[PDB]
Amino acid sequence: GSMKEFYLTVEQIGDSIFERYIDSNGRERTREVEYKPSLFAHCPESQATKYFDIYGKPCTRKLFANMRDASQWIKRMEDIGLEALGMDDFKLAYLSDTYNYEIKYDHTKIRVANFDIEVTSPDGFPEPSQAKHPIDAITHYDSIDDRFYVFDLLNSPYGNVEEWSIEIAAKLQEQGGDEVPSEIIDKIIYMPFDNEKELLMEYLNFWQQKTPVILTGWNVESFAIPYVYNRIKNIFGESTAKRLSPHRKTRVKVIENMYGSREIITLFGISVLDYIDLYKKFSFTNQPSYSLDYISEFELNVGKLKYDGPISKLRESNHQRYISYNIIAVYRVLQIDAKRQFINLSLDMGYYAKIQIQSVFSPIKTWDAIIFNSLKEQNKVIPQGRSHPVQPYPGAFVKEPIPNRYKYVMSFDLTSLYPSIIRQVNISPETIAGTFKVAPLHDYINAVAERPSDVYSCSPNGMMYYKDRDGVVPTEITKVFNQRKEHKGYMLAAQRNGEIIKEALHNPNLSVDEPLDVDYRFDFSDEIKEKIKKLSAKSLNEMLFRAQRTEVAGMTAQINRKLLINSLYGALGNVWFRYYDLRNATAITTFGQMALQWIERKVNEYLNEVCGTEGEAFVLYGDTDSIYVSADKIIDKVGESKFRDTNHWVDFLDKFARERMEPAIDRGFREMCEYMNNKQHLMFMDREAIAGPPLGSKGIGGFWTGKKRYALNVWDMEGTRYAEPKLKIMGLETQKSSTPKAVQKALKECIRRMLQEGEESLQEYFKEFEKEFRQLNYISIASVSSANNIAKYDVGGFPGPKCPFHIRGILTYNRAIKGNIDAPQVVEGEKVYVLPLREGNPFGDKCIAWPSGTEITDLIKDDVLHWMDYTVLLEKTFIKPLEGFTSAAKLDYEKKASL
Amino acid sequence: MKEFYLTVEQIGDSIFERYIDSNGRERTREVEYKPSLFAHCPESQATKYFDIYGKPCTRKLFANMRDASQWIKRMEDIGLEALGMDDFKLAYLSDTYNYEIKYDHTKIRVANFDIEVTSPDGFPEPSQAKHPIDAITHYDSIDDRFYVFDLLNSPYGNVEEWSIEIAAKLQEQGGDEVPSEIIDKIIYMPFDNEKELLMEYLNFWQQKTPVILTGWNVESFAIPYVYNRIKNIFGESTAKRLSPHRKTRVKVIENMYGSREIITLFGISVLDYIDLYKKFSFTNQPSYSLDYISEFELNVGKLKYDGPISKLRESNHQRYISYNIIAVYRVLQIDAKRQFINLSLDMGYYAKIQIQSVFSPIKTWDAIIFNSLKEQNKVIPQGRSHPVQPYPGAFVKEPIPNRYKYVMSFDLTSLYPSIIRQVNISPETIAGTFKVAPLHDYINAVAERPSDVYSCSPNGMMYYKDRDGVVPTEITKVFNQRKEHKGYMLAAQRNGEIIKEALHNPNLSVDEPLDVDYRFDFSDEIKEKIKKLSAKSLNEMLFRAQRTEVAGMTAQINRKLLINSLYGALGNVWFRYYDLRNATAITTFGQMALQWIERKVNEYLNEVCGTEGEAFVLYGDTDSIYVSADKIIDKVGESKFRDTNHWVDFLDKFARERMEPAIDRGFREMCEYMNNKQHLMFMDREAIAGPPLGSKGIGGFWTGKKRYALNVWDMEGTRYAEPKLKIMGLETQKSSTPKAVQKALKECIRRMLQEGEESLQEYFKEFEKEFRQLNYISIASVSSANNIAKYDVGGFPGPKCPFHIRGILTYNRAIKGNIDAPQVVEGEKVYVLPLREGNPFGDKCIAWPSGTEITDLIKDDVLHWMDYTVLLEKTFIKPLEGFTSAAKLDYEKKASLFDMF
DNA sequence: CAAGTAAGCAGTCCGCTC
DNA sequence: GAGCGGACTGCTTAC
DNA sequence: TCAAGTAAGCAGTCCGCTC
DNA sequence: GAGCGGACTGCTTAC
Ligand SMILES: O=c1ccn([C@H]2C[C@H](O)[C@@H](COP(=O)(O)NP(=O)(O)OP(=O)(O)O)O2)c(=O)[nH]1
Ligand SMILES: Nc1nc2c(ncn2[C@@H]2O[C@H](COP(=O)(O)O)[C@@H](O)[C@H]2O)c(=O)[nH]1
Ligand SMILES: Nc1nc2c(ncn2[C@@H]2O[C@H](COP(=O)(O)O)[C@@H](O)[C@H]2O)c(=O)[nH]1
Ligand SMILES: [Ca+2]
Ligand SMILES: [Ca+2]
Ligand SMILES: [Mg+2]
């Protein structure tokens, strides 16, 4: 045929590679291949051939008859103390050999399955490890069929019920409907069942015919998959359960972390990407709850499906709603992926690197595969992975700021610093050239230490690198970095475009039209800008949605390519990385420290010079690769009173940054490259934030409380001129998932008023929030914490020594729900709401905690509401942080007592 | 006399010390000890103080100890080394006791107590102490009395008083059989209520406050249970009266699998005898129950009783209390034998540490070295951080599995301490590095000479010869002190046979014991004056003779443990003097030395026997070579010998006169090659092994590394009346192997080595026939039980569940809902039995706590559904197949008609 | 489960000042 | 006795 | 298993492979 | 289904 072939899944099972793939005729195929791998040994110079290790030292290829021999050869070589070289993960070698080209994949041919089960349980949480309760609903969406297959148990030990009606389902809540979105109604294939055996046999047969390649859902890896597997195992036997693998192989793998161990089913020939796990790695959020209800609301702004009574009883109560719920749960994940596009990101990284798609969770595995593939094309031979001891190594510099208001601020930030350092210095395992005598870092920062080398590219940690060779790490990181730049470009264009539409919405023309057909990844032409100011509110609001969805797509693509390249840096400091080397890891961080503090000096020198001052500190702060510059003296040299409005002084500072500061900064960094004799100048420092108060207001513009704790009123970020000023808040309690939701909102308004409006406005809102606090929903004002090691501090159900406050809260909960089976149980390693309790409370302790994202069981709710300590809660979560902000910013959130 | 500390603690800025004063009276003092640490100087300010690298240091006296510790952090942040003893109570001890401490154990209050706690609802967790203490027995070393506290009334029993006369009687005369030697040492005290009992004991504790506190599980059970039980009634401050500094604290003991809690009683030294036993016994026991260790050590039986322990006090309060008393006595009997308390006192006072710190070689050795360096106005380096990582260890030759008829073994003397001294290894004696040939090239002496200037190890490390290392120096002094104190012990032995040959017909007179030193051979003056003494005054002179002997032994055992301890510390990141390159210099030097002298011995024997490239060295491990003597015996004829002693004499003569000089020459060449500071690779002949002359015995066999058996006639010049089996590694040696299978396999080996294949085949039949009639405990396997919970999946085995843990889960299901049923303890050991298919327990094995009978609830069913066939095959036949395969014989003449069925 | 370090605040324990 | 600060754990950010 | 070290054996589980 | 051996965990030696 005329289609390029690409793998779907791959496994090693003994001496066979089992591959699912799409063939030249674009059909799904499977094949068992007795892969003949090759490894490599350091040979003498005379025996030379086309194969050299990364240091250029020659190797002979050793072809093996099968894979189990190769692995044995490695163990034997490890006894002799001789290095066994090459790709020891044979299915990477196979993927590499079979697909010796850039893979173009067609996602319309990749079966992506999306499923959720319901298990009615009278006696608490149905543990998937023993699946002792009937499965009474499955919904399974298939991306090739674009259908929702619904499987519905009518008869179970916990009730006989009637068929679900798609007719009822479609309707609105009011006329007994379930509000199943109408755009999936014609995509639902319903199948009822008299017994569970029939339901399960039907789903397995169905699974044989529509075998997922990508399997996803919410908590599918930890609940649904193990629960279905063991439910089928317990009824029919193990052999029948293993039909969930198209190669009939499963492992009951033990996943370990620092607080215990859990069980997961590996289905060989399937790629499980649990969406909860994609969300945690790729979303760059930290959420107080990871329930689908909660993530659905945050991402889609779509509310919970309400239901009366406990989940354990919904089926008897309203099976019609039970089944609709199951169906929408599946849809929710598809909605979330449409927005975030984590499946597309996964496929993209998994095919770029030639790895199993689930290996996108592991940057070590992704990069091992990329660097392997890269070295193999040059007939070069990767090192044996070695054992190394974990030990600390130093990281970034963070300047101690003077706690203060800062009125006018411009920030600058190095482009992809650590990847840029890797490229600039030529930092690679095989580019190490030697070392030099290390002066103190201060001496390099101030340029009074002797030039390290006239021959080699240097870091100030004393490492020297060849300028005449290209390192594999520089080469391969450059490629991913360029992708990241391309996608960031699209993101910022989408961002700029959004503000134009936002601006056009202020004066919406009352007309009837349609959205304009544009690509949001590129700055609107003057022409399109003209046609936008003649649109209706309806048409503009649809275009704003399309822009923001384009920005989110850019954000996912760019920030996760940045994670991958930053994770190659990190991989250098991870003992399990093939190319682990603390000299190279600390070459990067130590260079970074010099670069930041070097450019701090250079910017101070330059601004003293423009402002006719001496030894003034203009750089008030920086962290890792950022500087924050006080612009007060720049504004004052013009005279604040000559500016027409805010956008006038913003324009001026924008021009000053670009035309005066950027050239000075590049001069500074070119001199630093020369001092270190680096391969390429790549220390590029873009203007980010222009921040200050609205002109003529008593806003303070910004404050720092200390390291990693500040707020700026931002008018322009990285060339995006905002319709309305945006708060950039880093580190403060507004940004922390542990801070109660209502208090996040309260503190942010406190900050907005401080920066924008000033002390009197702040003092006005403080009084306001104090008044409405005790009438706020109890969940909205509860603290959140992760609960680790509940058992370490559980001493016959009471706090042991050094018991953390949130753990105390959980022990208090556990005591109060003892011998109530249907009470919701706190899960080790998950998150809890926390409330303090007034002295004299019935729970016998000073706080209580319950599972985050839930109402507290009705058994105890009323007593909790009655004994909530509102005074301590307000003091701890609101007033204490606010006192931190206001002491920093040198104003008051209240006037003290006056008779 | 001279003043010695009892206990010491840092509480903030106050050292609290209990001590004996010059009058011999127990005292306390709080002290605001002003510590001193040290910093690096430029030459200008140099004074008497130098760090171990020589470089000069300023003393920095602090007002309190907390600013010294803060200064440390200040200095750390700065990246400046802060020299000297960070453990301030050691510096104090050093300052306060600047002389060899002479201690008097009759002035040290050693208490050991045991409590009983009647409980219906299973094990009474000490962390909650939710049941009445209904018995305590508390022996005091100074009073020589057992104080019995006996609760007469409780929620579980209103019972009568305990009769010391019914106690004394024999178990036939309705008695408890309480030893007669203690009956007149018991101070009984019944109580009508527990608060009364508890208050008195707390007040009795207040007079007679333990310095050394011991017992069996006192640390993990008895102490916390007494503490918390008193807290929970009388409140915290009252419970803190168990510290004589009213300062107590709850400690978090963390291991690889979870954590427990103990009560640190500040101002008491707790040496739980279970923990002393584990550390100092160098056994591995299938159980560490008092009852099991008592049986093993003393041969004293099992304190017996009917029904559960929860219903003993009610059923037979009279036996209950006797049990409680005899429990405490058992531990005294055990310490009478092993003397671990006295050894502990000796080492602590030697090192000038808390006595409880003898548990730690790192602490003990840090203190010893600090005190010596202080004396030379030198300054210990700061504790530094090092990444936990492996380093290479001993060499072990791969043996050819075979019978080996005639074997002679040679062992290097204290190898690792000797390499440290030989190569002068210390952090401050590191001088540089060299190009490293493969180890084989150093073994074969074809590698080029590392250095002409520095003492070398072949891991590439080079050391100054022109100075003595801190570590070498210190080890040499403890070596020298061992010799010192064994001399003293033997001189006091020889002096004690004099006095006991002057007691023959003692001059009936009125004299007084001579004021003599017993650590030296009596001058002929004293020998004369000793005969003209009375019986009284001789017998006192012999009591002092023998206490000089016991003290000499205690001290030299002490020194030996320290010598063998030190290498361990050197390999541990938390050791001040830890260096990785130093660790692997020690061990790689050891590898060379063994394989060097293997080459040398092979070369010499080939020359002596007129052969070439014959392998004489069949095996070696770390510090040992085993030499095949067959060809040596064949020079003279096997037939030419009169008896076994003749050829043993012959090999003893040949080793000492021929092989040892050849070995000394070998090791001398090696010393020059590595340019070492002194030659200390000394290799004594150890075993001579073979069959009885004219027998069909095979003499010995190897199955592999760390698995062999020798019939030994002579060890280090001691000629045995009867041959002794030296068995290493084999299942006879392993605590996991059933007691009865240990004995059977040993008799199998004995017959193989001494008698031959047919004798083996005769015994095999006999043990097979008797196996099914043996007691179930005697044929049960033993295993430690770690991570039970990990593999427990709703009461059933999880993935990769180990066999013994499957056994524990079977037991748990079987005793579920029986609260009075004995529970398996996480980290403790279990008996394991396989079960025949279709058994009611629902699995293929069961496990229960070791050193116990399995609970009567299930005992009958286990006995019925025991799989004897699987048991015999796994524990006995499979290992025997290993031995006989290696030795190239068979435990059966042929396969049975049944096996060919 | 899945690359890295720097560093903030909440809370416990405990000894010190007040 | 109350309040504080240092040494610590636990959690959660910023980069 | 609070409290020195590494080398290396066997029992048993999982699993592929061969009979 | 049983047996073997390799890759692993668990345990217990030797020194
Ligand atoms: O998760 C992270 C974030 C940052 N870092 C390090 C390396 C990286 O270069 C730097 C991040 O600084 P920024 O957050 O400003 N991002 P970066 O400079 O990489 O890229 P850019 O500024 O172009 O977005 O800190 C990590 O190692 N891991
Ligand atoms: N060049 C190279 N080939 C490797 C390495 N590890 C495994 N191989 C395998 O060795 C073979 C190389 O043969 P070639 O591609 O030159 O015909 C392929 O099967 C490839 O997967 C490695 O590190 N370098
Ligand atoms: N010599 C020495 N004394 C130390 C060291 N660490 C702490 N010290 C203490 O410093 C003081 C020195 O007093 P000196 O021995 O000079 O009379 C003593 O109290 C001693 O305990 C050390 O490393 N060397
Ligand atoms: Ca940056
Ligand atoms: Ca047959
Ligand atoms: Mg027989």
Residue numbers in the entry:
A (entry chain A): -1 to 897
B (entry chain B): 1 to 901
Quote the passages of the study that discuss this structure, keeping the authors' original sentences:
DNA polymerase from enterobacteria phage RB69 (RB69pol) has both polymerization and exonuclease activities and has been extensively studied as a model system for B-family DNA polymerases. RB69pol has the following distinct domains: the N-terminal, Exonuclease, Palm, Fingers, and Thumb domains, and a functionally important tail for the assembly of the holo-enzyme at the replication fork. DNA synthesis by DNA pols is catalyzed by two divalent metal ions, A and B. Metal ion A generates the attacking hydroxyl anion of the 3′-nucleotide of the primer strand (ptO3′) as a general base, and metal ion B stabilizes the leaving pyrophosphate as an acid in the transition state (TS). Upon binding of correct incoming dNTPs, a large conformational change occurs to close down the fingers domain and to bury the reactants inside the pol for catalysis.
Here, we report a crystal structure of the exonuclease-deficient RB69pol with the P/T duplex in a dimeric form at a resolution of 2.2 Å. Two RB69pol-P/T complexes are present in one asymmetric unit. The N-terminal domain (NTD) of RB69pol and the part of the P/T duplex away from the active site participate in the dimerization of the two complexes. Indeed, we observed that it had only a single Ca2+ ion bound at the B site but no Ca2+ ion at the A site. Similar to the classic ternary complex, the B site in MolA of this structure was coordinated by the catalytic carboxylates Asp411 and Asp623 and by the backbone carbonyl of Leu412; in turn, it binds the triphosphate moiety of incoming dNTP with α,β,γ-tridentate coordination. The other complex (MolB) is identified as a new open binary RB69pol-P/T complex in the pre-insertion state but without dUpNpp bound and with a vacant dNTP-binding pocket. There was a conserved small cavity in the NTDs of each RB69pol that tightly bound GMP.
